[PDB]
Amino acid sequence: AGDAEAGQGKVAVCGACHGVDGNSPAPNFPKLAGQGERYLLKQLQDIKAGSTPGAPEGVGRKVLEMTGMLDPLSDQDLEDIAAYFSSQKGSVGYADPALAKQGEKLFRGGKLDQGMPACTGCHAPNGVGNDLAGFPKLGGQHAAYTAKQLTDFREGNRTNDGDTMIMRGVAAKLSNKDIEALSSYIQGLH
Ligand code: HEC
Ligand code: HEC
């Protein structure tokens, strides 16, 4: 487990993009505030491994915007950072009903004709996730971020779901329109 207080002092480079508390309005940078600690730690570990120079292709999670950044941090440092951001209060954004009513139907009902489950069983009806179960919080997240993640799982650009194999299979069944709709709904969800 991380020491949130310690983590507060280990995030200087992060602030421009994620905000001092993990709530920056920058639409492509995911909000970190209030995310589950376990999920944050896993992503930090995966991003560090996948985004270091010379990382073997397909390892971890390669985040171009964070290349090399986590490299001087120990595993404990990453736990402390995870704890710090998880301790912050998440925020909620805008759900355009032109997109979000269909997003809601997909989020609650899936696409059963295609075998795709609903999102609520893992990410919760209000999007809070389940940190002890490995399920990230989605509610309130920036739509462009969420959309990129669903697209990347669909396309095989994000493959650090390999411990469960869950999201690649879910996202395989989503169209671009479905992804836009879900992402809008999620942005307003609490
Ligand atoms: C702007 C140049 C950034 C800086 C500085 C840092 N991060 Fe970042 N981070 C950024 C992007 C664009 C992304 C998303 C990449 C994508 O998939 O499209 C991220 C992602 C993260 C995540 C994952 C969050 C999730 O919901 O899975 C984490 C945990 C994260 N970033 C942490 C983080 C920390 C701790 C940083 C300082 C050491 C840091 N980021 C800097 C962009 C930028
Ligand atoms: C349980 C069987 C799940 C179902 C059904 C869906 N999701 Fe999921 N999702 C699940 C896990 C275990 C993971 C984590 C993968 C990781 O790298 O450890 C996730 C992740 C996501 C993400 C990424 C969040 C981020 O902060 O980057 C998104 C955007 C996401 N899931 C969306 C999503 C939607 C919209 C779903 C219904 C169509 C859905 N998930 C189903 C587990 C499960």
- Domain-wise residue ranges, the chain: 1-91, 92-190
Considering the segment(s) 1-91 as one domain, its CATH architecture is Orthogonal Bundle (1.10)
The number of the ligand 1 atom at minimal distance from the alpha carbon of 152 is: 17
Q: CA distances (Å), 174 to each of 3, 147, 159, 170, in order?
A: 38, 11, 17, 8
Query: How far is residue 132's CA from residue 114's CA, in Å, rounded to a whole number?
Result: 29
Query: How far is residue 64's CA from residue 117's CA, in Å, rounded to a whole number?
Result: 31
In the structure encoding, which two tokens stand for residue 4, read together? Answer: 């949130």
> Do 150 and 171 meet the contact criterion of CB atoms below 8 Å apart?
yes
Query: How far is residue 122's CA from residue 126's CA, in Å, rounded to a whole number?
Result: 11
Q: Is 146 in the pocket of ligand 2 (CB under 6 A)?
A: yes
Please choose, from the candidates 51, 69, 55, 77, the residue with its C-alpha nearest in 3D space to the C-alpha of residue 15: 69
In the structure encoding, which two tokens stand for residue 135, read together? Answer: 């399920």
Query: How far is residue 158's CA from residue 165's CA, in Å, rounded to a whole number?
Result: 11
Q: For the purposes of burial, counting CB atoms within 10 Å of the CB of 84, is it exposed (0-12), middle (13-18) or buried (19 or more)?
A: buried
Please check if 123 is assigned to a binding site. Answer: yes
Q: What is the resolution of this structure in A?
A: 1.2
Q: In CATH terms, are 1-91 and 92-190 the same topology?
A: yes
Give the HSE-up count for residue 122: Cα atoms under 13 Å, Cβ half-sphere.
14
Ligand whose nearest atom lies closest to the CA of 172? 2
The protein residue with its alpha carbon nearest to ligand 1, atom 40, reads: 14
Please check if 116 is assigned to a binding site. Answer: no
How far is ligand 1, taken at its centre, from the CA of residue 30, in Å? 7
Query: How far is residue 118's CA from residue 122's CA, in Å, rounded to a whole number?
Result: 9
Method: X-ray
Q: Is 135 in the pocket of ligand 2 (CB under 6 A)?
A: yes
CATH class of the domain defined by 92-190: mainly alpha
